[PDB]
Ligand binder design. Structure first.
Ligand code: ZN
Ligand code: ZN
Lengths: 146, 77, 69, 72
C-alpha cells in the first residue's frame, strides 16, 4: 500500500489540481487531510471544505475512507461528514487515485442522488423546494466553509 | 477548431482535436477511441462539475488548452 | 485465472498501454502482463489480486469472466 | 534556495523564490509583492492544511516545486 500511496503523493506534487489539495497528517502516510474548493456557480461557491482520508492497509484493493470535517448541506453527506457514494464502496476501482476521488466528490456536490439519499429530509427539500435547498446550502457554506 | 487535454484513468494526459460546438458525447467517443473505455463508464469533470451528455464544450466555457478530468461513472447514495 | 498473459517487450508493443493502474508503475521488459477480455492490460500480479475479490476491469468495469462483444 | 508555485482556483500560477527556512508570513509578503494582495487577505493551503504564519516551509514538508493554493 505505501508504495502506491507515495506515488499518489508524487502524482499530486507533479500535477496538482486547482480544485483540491491533500497530503499526510504528521508524516503518517495512511492518514491524510484534504481540501475541496466548492464549485463556482453553485451554493458551495467560495467555500473551502476540509476532509479526512484514511487509507486501508490493503489499499488500493479496498477504497480510502473519506469524510468531511467541514459541515456541508447535501443529500448524500450526513451530519458526521460521512459520504455515501458508490465509488467509496461497492463501485470502488483501484484505478481511482485520491486526486480522482477528491475530484469525484467535488462533482457529487452538484450531482446529488435524492432518491437513495443518506439524509432523507434534505433529499425531500432538494426535490420539492429547490430554492429552499439552495438557500440553506449557500447559508451553510457562508457559515461553516468561509 | 482547437485542442484540449484529458487526464485519463492512467494518469497520462492525452490531446484531443475538437470544436467548441462538439458535444460531450462526441468528446467521450474520441476518448473511447484512444482509451477503450465506453462513454457509459466515463465521467468528465471541469471546474469541479460533471459534464453532461447533450451539451457542448462551448456551453461549459471550455476553451483551447483546457484540461478535462476523466474519472469513473459514479452515483451518490 | 486462465485469462491471457504475455511478457512485455518495450521494443515490440502488442498494444498502446504503458502502465499498470493498480500499482501505478510502468510496464517493464519481461514483466508478465494480464489482459482482460476488454483488452485492458495490467501486471498479472497486480490485477490477479484485484480479480480474486472482484470480477471487474479496474479501468472499464467490464466483467472479466464474460466476453465483451 | 528553491522555487515553489502558488495557484488561485481560477487564477494563473505564480512562481516564488524561497528557502525552506522561510516563514509562511514571509511567503505571504512575497505574494503581496507580486500580486498586491495584503497578507491579511491571504489564506494559504498545502497538502490539505491551512498554513500558519509562524511556521516555515520545511515544517510543512514543502520542498522544491511544491504547489500551494491561495484562497482569498
Ligand atoms: Zn502493477
Ligand atoms: Zn477494461
Amino acid at each position: 500500500a505505501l508504495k502506491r500511496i507515495h506515488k499518489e503523493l508524487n502524482d499530486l506534487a507533479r500535477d496538482p489540481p486547482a480544485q483540491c489539495s491533500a497530503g499526510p497528517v504528521g508524516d503518517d502516510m495512511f492518514h491524510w487531510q484534504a481540501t475541496i474548493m466548492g464549485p463556482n456557480d453553485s451554493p458551495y461557491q467560495g467555500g473551502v471544505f476540509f476532509l479526512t482520508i484514511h487509507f486501508p492497509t490493503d489499499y488500493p484493493f479496498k477504497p480510502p475512507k473519506v469524510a468531511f470535517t467541514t459541515r456541508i448541506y447535501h443529500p448524500n453527506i450526513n451530519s458526521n461528514g460521512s459520504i455515501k457514494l458508490d465509488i467509496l464502496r461497492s463501485q470502488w476501482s483501484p484505478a481511482l487515485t485520491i486526486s480522482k476521488v477528491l475530484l469525484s466528490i467535488c462533482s457529487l456536490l452538484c450531482d446529488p442522488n435524492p432518491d437513495d439519499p443518506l439524509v432523507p429530509e434534505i433529499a425531500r427539500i432538494y426535490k420539492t423546494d429547490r430554492e429552499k435547498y439552495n438557500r440553506i446550502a449557500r447559508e451553510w457554506t457562508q457559515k461553516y466553509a468561509m | 477548431s482547437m485542442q484540449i487535454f484529458v487526464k485519463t484513468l492512467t494518469g497520462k494526459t492525452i490531446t484531443l482535436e475538437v470544436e467548441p460546438s462538439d458535444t460531450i458525447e462526441n468528446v467521450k467517443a474520441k476518448i473511447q477511441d484512444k482509451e477503450g473505455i465506453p462513454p457509459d463508464q466515463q465521467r468528465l469533470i471541469f471546474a469541479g462539475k460533471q459534464l453532461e451528455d447533450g451539451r457542448t464544450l462551448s456551453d461549459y466555457n471550455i476553451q483551447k488548452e483546457s484540461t478535462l478530468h476523466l474519472v469513473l461513472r459514479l452515483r451518490g447514495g | 485465472e486462465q485469462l491471457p498473459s504475455y511478457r512485455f517487450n518495450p521494443n515490440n508493443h502488442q498494444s498502446e498501454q504503458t502502465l499498470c493502474v493498480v500499482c501505478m508503475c510502468d510496464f517493464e521488459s519481461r514483466q508478465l502482463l494480464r489482459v482482460l477480455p476488454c483488452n485492458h492490460e495490467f501486471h498479472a500480479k497486480c490485477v490477479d489480486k484485484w480479480l480474486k475479490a472482484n470480477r471487474t476491469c479496474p479501468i472499464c468495469r467490464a466483467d472479466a469472466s464474460e466476453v465483451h462483444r
